[PDB]
């Protein structure tokens, strides 16, 4: 099919996604892997994972737009703290781009957001999820204080994900920050490159923790290797869950196996996202609209490196059967600040719509 705005696409139903991508980019992402993009990527997961094989369909419909369609329910659960921003940013698009279901909007918006992150894959995007569902129940969203056993069981119950797929999906923490874990600081990044979809998070979680970016007393947080902040450039935060996954015998080898393996990480993330994005649906009933996902920004191709103030002596290794790679260390004796903005600065307020969540 040829769209009215002269693009040839695979299927006529794909056409409406072209102006949607343009609108998302102009309005909330600005072609950046920044705050609003990150919040939308997080929403793809919180929307999709709220499904349970054991509890049955009444517990939730998976990748179904429930967060948008019932904005006063799940966003107010404690495990969904902070999801309101992404929900309130996407509702105006649901209202305007009113041939595309809420469910499809969430998954597509995440694919568009990710495409702005250098190194990210071009996600598969299937379309045709219905615009009617139910609100999910509480307890379906993993929390950072949870054990590895609890996390792996949650993902197995949601969609049969293997531990390999779970760790693969945590490549998203390469482009991720925390606003609610510590009430005293905002935008605390999980790696030193929160605007780049690289392997730094896998490396940096394996370093010895030396302090905290804010207070020392927060649920779900453990000591960070890069805690220095100044102004709006908040220090790195480490989640208890990521730490636990990096060291648990079930997942340690998988965790380590992504260090300095960018193409493998990106391909693995793409494969697990293909499964996540269709939870609650039979993929044989969704049309392939992958050609309307924007082409992602390329990586520079550089290897992973130890940040200044760290090195191999700081590693806490847990995989007996795989050799840890030889990596360089960035020069300097003290830690560099992790910039608050993609252009290196301190200030870059994003667009935020008011709304019902
Ligand atoms: C065991 C599983 C996981 C746990 C416990 C977890 C936990 C968290 C927590 C606590 C935050 C910080 C929220 C805040 O305080 O503002 C966060 C942020 C984030 N998470 Fe995860 N997460 C998990 C899996 C995932 C997966 C599977 C994805 C997506 C594929 C994802 C994508 C993100 C993104 C992109 C952010 C950053 C949001 C922003 O920077 O504004 N997470 N996660
Ligand atoms: C999916 O459902 C939503 C929510 O019912 C629909 O949203 C409404 O969209 C119309 C325009 O079509 C607006 O006048 C309303 O204000 C929206 N409602 C709410 C509660 O925001 C949406 O149109 C539906 N989309 C599809 C593809 O059927
Ligand atoms: C980032 O900044 C630190 C100092 O904060 C340096 O040691 C490093 O070399 C880089 O310039
Ligand atoms: Ca949902
Ligand atoms: Ca990164
Ligand atoms: Mn945030």
Curated annotation (Swiss-Prot):
Binding site for Ca(2+) 1: 47, 62, 64, 66
Keyword Ribonucleoprotein: no
Superkingdom of origin: Eukaryota
Site feature (Transition state stabilizer) residues: 42
Protein keywords: Calcium, Disulfide bond, Glycoprotein, Heme, Hydrogen peroxide, Iron, Lignin degradation, Manganese, Metal-binding, Oxidoreductase, Peroxidase, Secreted, Signal
CDD domains associated with the record: ligninase (cd00692)
Disulphide bonds in the chain: 3-15, 14-289, 33-117, 253-319, 341-348
Note on how the cofactor is bound: Binds 2 calcium ions per subunit.
Reaction equation(s) it catalyzes: 2 Mn(2+) + H2O2 + 2 H(+) = 2 Mn(3+) + 2 H2O
Family the UniProt entry places it in: Belongs to the peroxidase family. Ligninase subfamily.
Protein name as annotated: Manganese peroxidase 1
The species this protein was found in: Phanerodontia chrysosporium
């Amino acid at each position: 099919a040829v769209c009215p705005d002269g693009t040839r696409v695979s299927h006529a139903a794909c056409c409406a996604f072209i102006p949607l991508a343009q609108d998302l980019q102009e309005t909330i992402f600005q072609n950046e892997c920044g705050e609003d993009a990150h919040e939308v990527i997080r929403l793809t997961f919180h929307d999709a994972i709220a499904i349970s094989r054991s509890q049955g369909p009444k517990a939730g419909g998976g990748a179904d737009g429930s967060m948008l369609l019932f904005p006063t329910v799940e966003p107010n659960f404690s495990a969904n703290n902070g999801i309101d921003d992404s929900v309130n940013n996407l509702i105006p698009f649901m209202q305007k781009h009113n041939t595309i279901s809420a469910a499809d909007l969430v998954q597509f918006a995440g694919a568009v957001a990710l495409s702005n992150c250098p190194g990210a894959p071009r996600l598969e995007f299937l379309a045709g999820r219905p615009n009617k569902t139910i609100a999910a129940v509480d307890g379906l969203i993993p929390e950072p204080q949870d054990s590895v056993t609890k996390i792996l069981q949650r993902f197995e119950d949601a969609g049969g994900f293997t531990p390999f797929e779970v760790v693969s999906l945590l490549a998203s923490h390469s482009v991720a920050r925390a606003d609610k874990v510590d009430q005293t600081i905002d935008a605390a990044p999980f790696d030193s490159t929160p605007f780049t979809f690289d392997t730094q998070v896998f490396l940096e979680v394996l370093l010895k923790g030396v302090g905290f970016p804010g207070s020392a007393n927060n649920t779900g947080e453990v000591a960070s290797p890069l805690p220095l902040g100044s102004g709006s450039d908040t220090g790195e935060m480490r989640l208890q869950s990521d730490f636990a996954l990096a060291h648990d015998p079930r997942t340690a080898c998988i965790w380590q196996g992504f260090v300095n393996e960018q193409a493998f990480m990106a391909a693995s993330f793409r494969a697990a996202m293909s499964k996540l994005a269709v939870l609650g649906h039979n993929r044989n009933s969704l049309i392939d609209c992958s050609d309307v996902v924007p082409v992602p920004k390329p990586a520079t191709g550089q290897p992973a490196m130890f940040p200044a103030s760290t090195g191999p002596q700081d590693l806490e290794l847990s995989c007996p059967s795989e050799r840890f790679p030889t990596l360089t260390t960035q020069p300097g004796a003290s830690q560099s600040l992790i910039a608050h903005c993609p252009d290196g600065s301190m200030s870059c307020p994003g667009v935020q719509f008011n709304g019902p969540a």
